[PDB]
């Protein structure tokens, strides 16, 4: 079930049993890597890079075709984002909700959603500090988080 919702959805992705690269894919590992580099310079997060690569260039799995994941490739080249993608998006959502809330004081539903979002932020930050992705003293402050996103 969902972390903060009473939903039990099943919508997922069914990765095929064939890990091999399709024969009709003419892109080589370095070619896909260069495409990822260009998209990352354009500013796309790894999820968007994967979506663009799968939709347009016909590559099924970057890991299958290159041997490495998109974030691993970006970090190896040295242009991975300072914050993780999901943590960044959670902070962005929290900032948007706070900006809405400071004008709509009666939006108690928005306050409840804000509490849920900030709980998710703190749990994810705890995970990242455990994995040493984030600095050990990293803390999400509601006042100063607005300058980190958008």
């Amino acid at each position: 079930g969902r972390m903060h919702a009473p939903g039990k959805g099943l919508s997922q992705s069914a990765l095929p049993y064939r890990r091999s690269v399709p024969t009709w894919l003419k892109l080589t590992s370095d070619d896909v890597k260069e495409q990822i580099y260009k998209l990352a310079k354009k500013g796309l997060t790894p999820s968007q890079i994967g979506v663009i690569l799968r939709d347009s260039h016909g590559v099924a799995q970057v890991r299958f075709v290159t041997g490495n994941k998109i974030l691993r490739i970006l970090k190896s080249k040295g242009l991975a984002p300072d914050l993780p993608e999901d943590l960044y998006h959670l902070i962005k959502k929290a900032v948007a909700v706070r900006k809405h809330l400071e004008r709509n004081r009666k939006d108690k539903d928005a306050k409840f959603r804000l509490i849920l979002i900030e709980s998710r932020i703190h749990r994810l930050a705890r995970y990242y500090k455990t994995k040493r992705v984030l600095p050990p003293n990293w803390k999400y402050e509601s006042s100063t988080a607005s300058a980190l996103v958008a």
Partner: peptide
Amino acid sequence: KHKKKRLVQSPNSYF
């Protein structure tokens, strides 16, 4: 059957 509930997972999409 659903993609996940098959004997072995198979995507319903293609290229």
